[PDB]
């Protein structure tokens, strides 16, 4: 939209329906410049590794990534307690993801 208008609101809550629970979590993030905008070949030689079992070859990218693959990223301790004390099972169904209020310094 514009410089002076927020592009999203803070949504962080849990909604408990009959057979469904909807968890929403919002966090503030910071993203630096990685590898000074470069791709770099990496290996156990570059990191000083010696053992065969820990040898590797790969690349480090200037990109970051968002990870929310831990349960506490979505469930508060009270919500987790409710889930574990009141249900025989659970599974994820669908996902909604948002990035907003971008600020570059």
């Amino acid at each position: 939209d514009g410089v002076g208008s927020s592009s999203g609101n803070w949504h962080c809550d849990s909604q408990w329906l009959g057979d469904r629970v909807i968890t929403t979590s919002t966090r503030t993030w910071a993203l630096p410049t990685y590898n000074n905008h470069l791709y770099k070949q990496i290996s156990n030689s570059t990191s000083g590794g010696s053992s065969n079992d820990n040898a590797y070859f790969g690349y480090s990218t200037p990109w970051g990534y968002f990870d929310f693959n831990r349960f506490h990223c979505h469930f508060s301790p009270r919500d987790w307690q409710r889930l574990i004390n009141n249900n025989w099972g659970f599974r994820p169904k669908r996902l909604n993801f948002k990035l907003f209020n971008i600020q570059v310094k």
């Binding site: 508060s76 301790p77 009270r78 987790w80 307690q81 004390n85």
Partner: protein, 105 residues
Amino acid sequence: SPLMGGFGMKHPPPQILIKNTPVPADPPTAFNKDKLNSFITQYSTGQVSVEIEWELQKENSKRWNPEIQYTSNYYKSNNVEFAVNTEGVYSEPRPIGTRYLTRNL
């Protein structure tokens, strides 16, 4: 509110009164005006069913840390709490209240 605990009502559930109808024994062959005092020894048995619908007030707390909950103790014991003994005697090992969840004042 009843001082021993519970719900006070001007019109509570009505008293349900039951009695075995007296069955006189053999009366004398000559009329006697006195009330009969010789009856057949009797008793009755049967089944009784009561169904009560309860309305619930769900909790909508925003508390972050887990609540206190009533729970059985996993530690080994000779008998299971709220179960029968080896002689078939059912027992209630402790009084259980209702106030474990929390809310602000």
